[PDB]
C-alpha cells in the first residue's frame, strides 16, 4: 500500500491526511515546497510519526473549490516537471 | 446494622475521584462479558471506553454503596450522584 487515506479525512475530502509508505523527507519536503506554490492550498505540512518505520503522514487543507486528491495530483505533476527541466538543462550543459 | 434511609443522606453528593474509577471498571467488565449496552455504539471496539460513553450520559445501572465506619451505608444510584 503506497499512499493511503487516513481516517481523519474531512467528509468533503477537503482535509485528508495522505500517509505515504516507505518514504521520508526526500520526497516530503520537495512535495510540500511544490504544494505551497499552489494558490488553492490553505495548509500544507508534513511530519514523521517515527523514523524507525518509513511512514510520512502528510496533510492537505484547501479551499472548497477543489479537493485534496487533485491538489496532490497536480503538485506531483509540477514537481515531475521540475525534475524534467533540471535534467534537460544540466544534460544540455555538458556535451 | 442498618441501611441509611434515602431521605437522610450525608455522604457527599459528588462522584468521588475513586467512585468513577471503580464504576467504570465494572461497567467495562459487564460489557466485556456480553452485557446489554444502554447507549448506541459509534463503531466503538474497546469494551471499556464504551462505558465512558455510557457514563458521559449517566445512563448507567449499578448503584453504589457508601459504608459509614459506624456500620451504616448509603445506596446511591449512579444517576443520583453528581
Amino acid at each position: 500500500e503506497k499512499i493511503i487515506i487516513l481516517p481523519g479525512h474531512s467528509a468533503d475530502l477537503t482535509s485528508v491526511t495522505f500517509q505515504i509508505q516507505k518514504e521520508d523527507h526526500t520526497l516530503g519536503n520537495s512535495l510540500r515546497y511544490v504544494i505551497m506554490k499552489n494558490p488553492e492550498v490553505e495548509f500544507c505540512g508534513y511530519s514523521i510519526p517515527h523514523p524507525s518505520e518509513a511512514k510520512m503522514n502528510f496533510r492537505i487543507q484547501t479551499a472548497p473549490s477543489t479537493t485534496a486528491v487533485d491538489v496532490l495530483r497536480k503538485g506531483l505533476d509540477d514537481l515531475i516537471d521540475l525534475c524534467d527541466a533540471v535534467t534537460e538543462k544540466f544534460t544540455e550543459q555538458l556535451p | 446494622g442498618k441501611a441509611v434511609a434515602k431521605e437522610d443522606r450525608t455522604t457527599t453528593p459528588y462522584m468521588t475521584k475513586y467512585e468513577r474509577a471503580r464504576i467504570l471498571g465494572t461497567r467495562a467488565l459487564q460489557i466485556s462479558m456480553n452485557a446489554p449496552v444502554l447507549v448506541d455504539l459509534e463503531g466503538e471496539t474497546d469494551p471499556l471506553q464504551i462505558a465512558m460513553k455510557e457514563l458521559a450520559q449517566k445512563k448507567i445501572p449499578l448503584l453504589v454503596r457508601r459504608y459509614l465506619p459506624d456500620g451504616s451505608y448509603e445506596d446511591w444510584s449512579v444517576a443520583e450522584l453528581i
Binding site: 487516513l6 481523519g8 474531512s10 477537503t14 482535509s15 491526511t17 510540500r32 515546497y33 505551497m36 495548509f43 500544507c44 505540512g45 508534513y46 511530519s47 510519526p49 503522514n57 496533510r59 487543507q61 | -
Partner: protein, 145 residues
C-alpha cells in the same frame, strides 16, 4: 509533598523556547505551517479533524508570523470546544534587564489564549508553578495539560 509540579520540559526545550519566543523572530508561511503541523501531528493522537491558524502579525511588505503568534496558535488548536481562552500574567525566569534596560518582555502576559508579550522559559513551562502549563492543568483539565 508540595503543590510544585515536577513533570515538564527540560534543558533543550526551555532553551529553544527562550530563543524562539523572543520577539526578534519571524516566519514566512512555509515555516509557520510546517512548524504548526510538526507540533500538532493530530493523527497520531486523533480526536481532531482540521488545522486552524491565525493571520500573520505583519502583512506588508511581507507576511510574517512571530513565534509568539505560534504559541498562541497551538494554544488555540487545543482550546476545548467551549472553554474560554486563557488570560494570565506571570513573571518569566530570565530577568527583564537581560533583553534591555527597561525591557518590556520581563513577564509573560497574554489574554484569551493568545501570547501577547514576555518570553517563555523554565518558569513558564516546566517544573514550575503559575507558569503557563500549570494554569493549563487547572483550566482545561489534566489530559489537555
Amino acid at each position: 509533598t508540595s503543590g510544585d509540579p515536577l513533570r515538564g520540559l527540560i534543558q533543550d526545550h526551555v532553551v529553544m523556547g527562550v530563543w524562539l519566543t523572543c520577539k526578534d523572530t519571524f516566519y514566512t508561511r512555509d515555516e509557520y505551517q510546517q512548524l504548526l503541523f510538526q507540533a500538532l501531528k493530530p493523527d497520531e493522537t486523533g480526536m481532531y479533524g482540521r488545522i486552524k491558524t491565525l493571520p500573520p502579525a505583519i502583512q506588508r511588505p511581507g507576511i510574517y508570523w512571530t513565534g509568539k503568534q505560534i504559541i498562541s496558535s497551538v494554544l488555540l488548536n487545543l482550546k476545548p470546544s467551549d472553554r474560554p481562552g486563557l488570560n494570565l500574567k506571570s513573571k518569566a525566569k530570565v530577568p527583564g534587564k537581560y533583553w534591555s534596560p527597561d525591557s518590556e518582555e520581563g513577564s509573560v502576559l497574554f489574554d484569551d489564549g493568545e501570547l501577547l508579550c514576555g518570553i517563555l522559559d523554565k518558569s513558564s513551562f516546566g517544573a514550575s508553578a503559575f507558569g503557563l502549563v500549570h494554569s493549563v492543568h487547572e483550566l482545561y483539565g489534566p489530559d489537555i495539560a
